[PDB]
Amino acid sequence: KKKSITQSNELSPGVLKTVKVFVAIKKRIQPGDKMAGRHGNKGVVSRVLPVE
């Protein structure tokens, strides 16, 4: 950790500093999504219906 040049990298000359931001967002299936079967049958969801 202290073995680094002090920037953790060479940094490329002429670069004062850099910052890395990580964002994780959950995604849920919605209409227009594509579902493909193992047998090779594929389809795109058109609508979501009520359970009844």
Binding site: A24, P50, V51, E52
Partner: protein, 223 residues
């Protein structure tokens, strides 16, 4: 030639299985009543479930607690399956759980506050590999499913607050059948529920909602 239907909670079976049956029908109005009961209970029933959980030491769902086999996302998933029964006037309440057990945490571990009822004593919120202090707060409010598109995300004030989705409806399955006694029919309905709400009361509530909806037609008026 007048027939009026009655409700009997008969043939109760299973952990939570009931078969409410009406001895009297109009000899042809039975099928319509069964269809209405099946449709109303699934989408009209309102149940109270946790919508917000705050961990003692977490900044986000994607974090790992020390000496805990379960993940924070996994803990949220265990929390969602939890079944809660609430008083009519409670509307909204907050539940505090704090445990120092070195074994497996459970829904029954939740403090026995007044009004709050936990059906799923068996379900375990989390398992602790080594002895540690674990505490969290879950907000419980009455709610109904209005569909995924029409859902408010819900405001979070604390930094640690985590949004949790809740399935308000408690009726897992609805089944109806019609038997004709001759000049009359008997309606048999099979209802499967988490057991939070008694089946006869749920059937009466569904019939009341259907009657309220049909009330406007006889009037034929805006109000």
């Amino acid at each position: 030639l007048e027939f009026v239907p009655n409700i009997q909670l008969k043939e109760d079976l299973g952990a939570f299985s009931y078969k409410v049956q009406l001895s009297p029908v109009e000899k042809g109005m039975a099928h319509i009543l069964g269809n209405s009961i099946r449709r109303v209970l699934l989408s009209s029933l309102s149940g109270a479930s946790i919508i917000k959980v705050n961990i003692a030491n977490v900044l986000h769902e994607y974090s790992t607690l020390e000496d805990v086999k379960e993940d924070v996302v996994e803990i949220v998933s265990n929390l969602k399956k939890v079944a809660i029964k609430l008083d009519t006037g409670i509307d909204r309440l907050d539940l505090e759980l704090s445990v120092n057990k070195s074994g497996v945490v459970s829904a029954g571990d939740f403090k026995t506050t007044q009004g709050v009822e936990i059906i799923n004593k068996d379900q375990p919120i989390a398992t602790l590999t080594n002895q540690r202090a674990f505490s969290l707060t879950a907000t419980v409010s009455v709610g109904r499913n209005v569909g995924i598109l029409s859902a408010i995300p819900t405001e979070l004030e604390r930094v640690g607050d985590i949004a949790v989705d809740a399935d308000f409806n408690p009726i897992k399955r609805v089944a109806f059948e019609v038997f004709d006694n001759g000049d009359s029919e008997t309606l048999e309905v099979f209802v499967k529920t988490n057991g939070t709400i008694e089946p006869l009361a749920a059937v009466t509530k569904a019939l009341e909602y259907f009657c309220e909806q049909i009330s406007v037609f006889v009037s034929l008026r805006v109000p």
